[PDB]
Amino acid sequence: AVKKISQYACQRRTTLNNYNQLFTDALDILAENDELRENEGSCLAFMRASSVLKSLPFPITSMKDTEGIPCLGDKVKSIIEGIIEDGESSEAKAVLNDERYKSFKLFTSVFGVGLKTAEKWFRMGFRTLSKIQSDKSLRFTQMQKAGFLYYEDLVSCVNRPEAEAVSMLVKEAVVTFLPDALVTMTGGFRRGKMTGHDVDFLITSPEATEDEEQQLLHKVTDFWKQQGLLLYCDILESTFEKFKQPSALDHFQKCFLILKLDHGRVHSEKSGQQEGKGWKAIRVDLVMCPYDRRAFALLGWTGSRQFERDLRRYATHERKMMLDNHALYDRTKRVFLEAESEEEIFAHLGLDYIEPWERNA
DNA sequence: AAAAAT
Ligand SMILES: Cc1cn([C@H]2CC[C@@H](COP(=O)(O)OP(=O)(O)OP(=O)(O)O)O2)c(=O)[nH]c1=O
Ligand SMILES: [Mg+2]
Ligand code: NA
Numbered sequence: 254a255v256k257k258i259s260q261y262a263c264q265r266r267t268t269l270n271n272y273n274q275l276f277t278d279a280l281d282i283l284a285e286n287d288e289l290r291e292n293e294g295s296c297l298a299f300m301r302a303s304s305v306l307k308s309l310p311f312p313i314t315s316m317k318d319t320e321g322i323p324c325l326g327d328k329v330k331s332i333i334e335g336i337i338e339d340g341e342s343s344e345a346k347a348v349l350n351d352e353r354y355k356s357f358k359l360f361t362s363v364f365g366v367g368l369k370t371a372e373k374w375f376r377m378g379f380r381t382l383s384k385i386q387s388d389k390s391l392r393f394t395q396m397q398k399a400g401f402l403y404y405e406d407l408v409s410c411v412n413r414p415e416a417e418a419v420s421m422l423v424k425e426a427v428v429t430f431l432p433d434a435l436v437t438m439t440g441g442f443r444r445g446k447m448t449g450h451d452v453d454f455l456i457t458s459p460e461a462t463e464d465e466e467q468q469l470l471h472k473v474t475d476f477w478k479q480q481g482l483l484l485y486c487d488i489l490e491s492t493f494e495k496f497k498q499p500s501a502l503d504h505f506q507k508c509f510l511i512l513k514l515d516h517g518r519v520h521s522e523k524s525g526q527q528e529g530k531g532w533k534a535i536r537v538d539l540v541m542c543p544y545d546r547r548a549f550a551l552l553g554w555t556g557s558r559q560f561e562r563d564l565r566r567y568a569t570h571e572r573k574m575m576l577d578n579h580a581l582y583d584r585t586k587r588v589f590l591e592a593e594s595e596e597e598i599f600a601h602l603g604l605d606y607i608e609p610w611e612r613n614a
Numbered sequence: 615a616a617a618a619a620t
Binding site (some may be wrong): 327364365367368369371384394396397440451453487501502503507508509538540551553554556560578 | 616617618619620
């Protein structure tokens with residue numbers, strides 16, 4: 254009954270009602286393992302397979318249900334077969350018991366710790382965070398110190414009442430210095446997610462001067478420092494150049510923060526909870542972009558990561574276009590394509606518009 | 615420095 258399924262996430266509608274979580278959770282574990290081991294192509298195969306299954310409006314209950322579904326190779330179909338058999342993946346279970354996997358997941362869960370540092374610590378014989386933190390020869394970056402100091406709060410995922418409380422704080426701070434500014438919550442929460450590892454925002458101003466737009470993130474973070482809310486701050490100045498071709502991280506001015514979010518600012522509706530210290534450390538990402546690039550930045554920062562990947566792949570292989578967070582370039586017409594909305598980008602790409610809550614690829 | 619942060 255269902256229409257042909259595209260190999261591209263940007264040509265699929267993926268809502269949060271996942272009927273194939275048994276399969277997807279196992280494929281996500283297998284993808285994450287090849288990623289920490291730096292096997293791009295094998296991880297890529299599991300990510301694409303996981304992504305297609307998330308788009309299905311029904312659960313896979315037999316191998317005949319896998320017919321006509323793209324991105325399901327022989328290796329992926331044997332994993333599906335094993336899960337149909339007893340409800341569990343022996344392959345994912347072996348990864349979960351692997352010493353490298355456990356250590357890499359554990360070490361990279363620390364803010365300021367990436368693949369290189371996790372690898373360094375694993376090859377040194379470390380297996381637990383307790384032994385890393387208490388070691389006398391190791392030296393930590395200021396990001397890693399914050400990562401270890403606020404670890405429990407940061408490893409606890411942010412919920413919607415918390416994200417909304419942060420949105421109010423961001424909007425009140427930004428409107429203080431730029432009353433004409435547009436503040437949009439991006440990331441997972443824009444896609445309708447109930448949790449996240451952080452909260453993301455896109456800030457833009459139609460009438461700000463070059464200086465007002467450069468100074469805004471400094472004014473907002475200083476305002477929070479004065480109030481004692483800024484636990485961690487790292488502001489990356491713009492490396493954005495208007496005429497370079499779109500050919501990881503974008504070049505806009507941005508900041509990676511840890512905010513002290515007072516529980517009193519959260520409208521939780523939840524009762525029976527224990528207040529403890531009365532606040533929670535929340536990872537917050539702010540992006541400032543020039544007004545004319547607002548649609549590309551919004552598309553880039555809304556995600557999901559797989560939706561973004563397939564958008565760029567589709568643009569390259571199907572349209573001979575170059576897309577990133579700053580622009581869209583048409584290699585045939587030899588012209589940069591302008592957009593005032595996400596809808597105009599989809600139209601330029603010849604794609605049916607996919608709503609933010611349908612981008613959960 | 616490389617590395618981290620989306
Ligand atoms: C890191 C990363 C991110 N992106 C885009 C797409 C998403 C946004 C926000 O990032 P995030 O990981 O928090 O995403 P989010 O979906 O909000 O996930 P969480 O709920 O926080 O886990 O950035 C990307 O294109 N490539 C990447 O490698
Ligand atoms: Mg996020
Ligand atoms: Na990390």
